Amino acid sequence: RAVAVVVDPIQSVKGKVVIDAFRLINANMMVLGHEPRQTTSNLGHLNKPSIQALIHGL
Amino acid sequence: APPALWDLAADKQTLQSEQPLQVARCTKIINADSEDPKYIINVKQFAKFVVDLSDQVAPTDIEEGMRVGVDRNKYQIHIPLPP
Amino acid sequence: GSYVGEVVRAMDKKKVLVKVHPEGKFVVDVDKNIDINDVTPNCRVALRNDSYTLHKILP
Amino acid sequence: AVDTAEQVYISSLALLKMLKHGRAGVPMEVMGLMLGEFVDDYTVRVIDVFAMPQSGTG
Amino acid sequence: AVQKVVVHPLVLLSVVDHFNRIGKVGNQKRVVGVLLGSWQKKVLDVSNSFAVPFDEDDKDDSVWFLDHDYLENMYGMFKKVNARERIVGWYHTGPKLHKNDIAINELMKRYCPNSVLVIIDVKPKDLGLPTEAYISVEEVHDDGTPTSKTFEHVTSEIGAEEAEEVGVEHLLRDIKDTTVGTLSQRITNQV
Amino acid sequence: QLTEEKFIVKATNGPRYVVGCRRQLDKSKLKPGTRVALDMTTLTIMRYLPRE
Amino acid sequence: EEERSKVDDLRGTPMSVGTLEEIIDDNHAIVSTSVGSEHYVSILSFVDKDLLEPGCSVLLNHKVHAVIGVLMD
């Protein structure tokens, strides 16, 4: 599993404490579809990281 | 684009080769050297820096006021260059 | 916030060179909901500061 | 060849350890370790989180 | 000497951890954690703490078990990661002050400086403030009774620094803020 | 100084900011004409900066 | 066609216009800009490198400045 988390209160305001846990994809999964994650309900909540350079920029 | 065709097929290994060769601290030239670890260096943006030599370059391959390739992350001297 | 783009020349490959504040001159495709030909060159526009997508023409 | 739908359980223990660690989020890179138990494939629970002393390497 | 203390909610949340890491044994005693804080200013400021395996006897109160090596190692590694905070005192989570607590206190009066004691509650059913700072001082008595270690209450406030406010307020979404006017005034004026 | 607590600062590098007052220090040295010292976090004032 | 449209990531939003200084036979050239940023990348497609006529303005990035193409003027 090997969870990786970045806390960054420096540019995070005191109103929201938005933190995210990040993941590594396998490099051999590039031929198939990227993330075969079932139960796609919560991804509407996972599009809250929508900064227009970092999330889909990287 | 036909010259960029075979090079476009040769752009596959440029992604596995993009993780090496990436480093450039704007090719800072040195000024002097106080002792064989510590080198007094100046970047072109007028910030005087000090870093140690890496293991890949000999200190006899250090020349006074030399433009060389140098890291922008660990800041060490990966490879030199002739001019 | 976001930056202030100024297009000086529109490029025909739908990748508009835009004159930016120093260390700028960032050539980019602007957002898909806005057409390229409406953006007239030598006029100031509204540009995002990272994603480099145009909002509107400015006087 | 399998992947599932995982979701990360976060206590306030780990949270305020990352917030004391975020007050310890001065400009330098800081280090810490997340602990807990993996009960299945697709759920993950954190309990124990501590910090690590800094180094000039980061 | 010291007028007031400041205890951050992080350590009491680690007393929630004291009631987490039990493992269901049937003991649930006054588990002592090693209180850390800032005695540096005249006000005492608790930042964080840890806990130590502590056992008493069923019948005998005066049997009590601590560790110096665990104190110097956990405090050593903690001082290695953060030397801006030092040892200050301790606490038991039991509701009752035992006779043994002068002797249990005496170990951290020796090796640490004048240590503060905190009585808190195992079950937070008390409407009152759970934390009471009891200064460990010997006071001379007018009746002529011999001088002993006496636990006088030092007044306390529970404050959070910056991010503990944000994380707690994000975790709740149930508490309402200051909100002067009808409601937050009149509810205090209710109860 | 607009609010007696909170005023305008002028950095050496050029950008201007507004800061608060620390609970320890008082308004004696905080009068204008005083070059001060600031922090990256919260823009607090630990002490001032005497010119020379 | 997909390989023609896979280098779009480099010429996308992370793209800048720099000024080339010289072309090096070690295939990593040295560039410049308003601060004169010198970054050397082993070359990529769409560049001419002979009629490129060094000392001119070329196309750079917000990324590692891999030269994805050139633009005449």
Add this chain to the structure above:
Amino acid sequence: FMHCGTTSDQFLRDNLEWLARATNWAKFTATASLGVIHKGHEKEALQLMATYLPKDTSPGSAYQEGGGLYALGLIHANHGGDIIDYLLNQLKNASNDIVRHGGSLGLGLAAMGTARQDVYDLLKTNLYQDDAVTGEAAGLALGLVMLGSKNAQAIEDMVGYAQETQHEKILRGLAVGIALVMYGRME
């Protein structure tokens, strides 16, 4: 939706390359939707599910089998000629979380409303491994089987089984599980 009841596999006879192309739960939902297509067939259903790999008798993907039972329960919903007797020996077969999960779904759905204490019992030992997905199926079947029965130790068994675990799919499966039992207990 469109091929329900008309038993038309002929749309899904266009290709094998668009169905089995991914080893995932998508094949389980594909075999399930195959169960939605045809219904009410006492020989050709089990025969047709047996037709899919009677070669080595070892599916590399278990979702064909567990979708065979989950589909089969969709076929035999409220049939009086239940093959439930065979599916107890088929749930007696040792397999991980597809005979357990899909076997709980299909077998409990075919046993819907019967209020049998036996399928109640094997349902309990299906949920006693504390896994979220197969016990989620155990709750979903348990609401089906206990319709109107209102067994006394069952409700306190479910809510007493609820707070003693940190898994969440056991909580929603027992959520619907204690939901469906309560019918006409308005009073």
Add this chain to the structure above:
Amino acid sequence: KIMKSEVLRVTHELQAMKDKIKENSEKIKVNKTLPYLVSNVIELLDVDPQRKGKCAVIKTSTRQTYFLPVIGLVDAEKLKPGDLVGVNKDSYLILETLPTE
């Protein structure tokens, strides 16, 4: 010599102190590894009314001014308004000062 046999505990304390200076002296090498840039120093004594006033004025080579007290190790040939000093990344501290010319 019974009164002088308490000296043994003192010597075990002090050789224990020599056992425990190895780690906090060991972090000297990993914190003070690379002074990354060169920054101009201007010495300016402060007054705090211990609470003693002691300060210096810094200027980076990229001409950015920050604030700091007199810090580092025991200084004799330091305290000069000079250059070629030791500094970490954002700590902006003084660790190793050297003469430029």
